[PDB]
Symmetry: C2
Subunit: 51 residues, 2 copies
């Protein structure tokens, strides 16, 4: 849910910041509070926002 | 020798962003790229930036 001049394509979609990883399956960004909740909520693999 | 380490900002001390957790002992902010490694490199007690 991002649009109207976002100016930020490297941060959690909900917090909009404090995130450096994006779920490969969900194709969405998640902050440490979310990335850690997912990897703990079950079994998921996320990649770093870097190249 | 003794030095002051305070940071009112809420982001990694190195990346300066993409962080939502800080070590209580080191009193430093770390991003998902550093926090994940920190907990995997050693055992430290950190808390979420939320409150
Ligand atoms: Zn996911
Ligand atoms: Zn989030
Ligand atoms: Zn960092
Ligand atoms: Zn530490």
């Amino acid at each position: 849910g991002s649009r109207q001049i976002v100016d930020a394509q490297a941060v959690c979609t909900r917090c909009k910041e404090s995130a450096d990883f994006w779920c490969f399956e969900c194709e969405q960004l998640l902050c440490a509070k979310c990335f850690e909740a997912h990897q703990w909520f079950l079994k998921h693999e996320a990649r770093p926002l870097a190249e």
